[PDB]
Amino acid sequence: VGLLRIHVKRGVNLAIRDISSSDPYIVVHCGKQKLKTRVVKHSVNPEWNDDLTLSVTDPNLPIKLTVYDYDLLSADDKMGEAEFHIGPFIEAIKFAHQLGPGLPNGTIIKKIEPSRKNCLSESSHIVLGKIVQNMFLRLQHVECGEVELQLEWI
Amino acid sequence: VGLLRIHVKRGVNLAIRDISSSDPYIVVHCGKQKLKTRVVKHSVNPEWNDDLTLSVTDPNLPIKLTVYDYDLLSADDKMGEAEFHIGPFIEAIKFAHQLGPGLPNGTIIKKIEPSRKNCLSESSHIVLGKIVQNMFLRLQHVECGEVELQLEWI
Ligand SMILES: [Ca+2]
Ligand SMILES: [Ca+2]
């Protein structure tokens, strides 16, 4: 158990779902938690700069992220989804805690490579007072779009 | 200058463009060469197993790959595109030639990591009598699909 802070920074080249634009927001859901960002109107490169805080019980179940086009009068169209795992992040955190302040500032603790078994668009760095994981996610099931976020815990 | 053999092996989870299926084929084009594979009817996981042979003049210009849904009565719908570079491959080839048969069979000469500046879905290996590059490409501008190919030269 712990508290995962997801800083949702921005979307890049998101899909159009309302002809001229989209009104994108993100839903994160982990088991049964569902948290949402604010809506950015008429944008496919939204700068959400929005923080979500997730309560982790089970560090091994994936965290799902979905982008939607907000529309007041109909169900919101999906604009891509991605999953990520926070196992490696939680382990990098345990380590840094057990080493103490002897671990130098700016140290990259772990590099995670994009593969066919994840949604990274580039190598994800776990970096050190705070351990942080920088993620650039390739959205699945959509013709374009990426989301950039940074993870914190706890 | 040289001859690039592109073994187009298969497509994986390609997009639907004719409701129930697609009839996918690939066009490769490098500057002004345009070469096409055979059409696989009613498939989104086509096993093309088809060879294309490209004449390279300029090793630094990208090779573009596009998948299309063949339809006799209308322009063929695009089903994704990708670009790849053969610079690193040609250099791995020069090397193996200059070393000679002292270079062990099965040796991985180069690993190329997926990044936001390429279309790899996983790390691409350049491997040795023949130098070969294995590529798994993530298609762009489409909601799903990958193409697996192997490069040979010359
Ligand atoms: Ca809308
Ligand atoms: Ca068709």
Swiss-Prot record, chains A, B:
CDD domains linked to this entry: C2_ArfGAP
Acetylation keyword on record: yes
Cofactor(s) recorded in Swiss-Prot or TrEMBL: Ca(2+)
PROSITE patterns linked: C2 (PS50004)
Span of domain C2: 1-100
Subcellular locations according to the entry: Cell membrane; Nucleus
Tissues of expression: Expressed in roots.
Binding residues for Ca(2+) 1: 17-18, 69, 71, 77
Any one GO molecular-function label of the UniProt entry: protein homodimerization activity
Protein's UniProt keywords contain Amino-acid biosynthesis: no
InterPro entries: C2_dom (IPR000008), C2_domain_sf (IPR035892), CAR1-11 (IPR044562)
Positions that bind Ca(2+) 2: 18, 23, 69-71
Record text on subunit structure and interactions: Dimers and oligomers. Binds to PYR/PYL/RCAR abscisic acid intracellular receptors in an ABA-independent manner, both at the plasma membrane and in the nucleus. Interacts directly with PYR1, PYL1, PYL4, PYL6 and PYL8. Binds phospholipids in a Ca(2+)-dependent manner.
Alphabetical list of PANTHER family matching this protein: PROTEIN C2-DOMAIN ABA-RELATED 1, PROTEIN C2-DOMAIN ABA-RELATED 4
Entry function: Stimulates the GTPase/ATPase activities of Obg-like ATPases. Mediates the transient calcium-dependent interaction of PYR/PYL/RCAR abscisic acid (ABA) receptors with the plasma membrane and thus regulates ABA sensitivity. Binds liposomes in the absence of exogenous Ca(2+), but this activity is enhanced in the presence of Ca(2+) and generates membrane curvature.
Entry similarity comment: Belongs to the plant CAR protein family.
The name this protein goes by in its record: Protein C2-DOMAIN ABA-RELATED 1
Organism listed in the record: Arabidopsis thaliana (Mouse-ear cress)
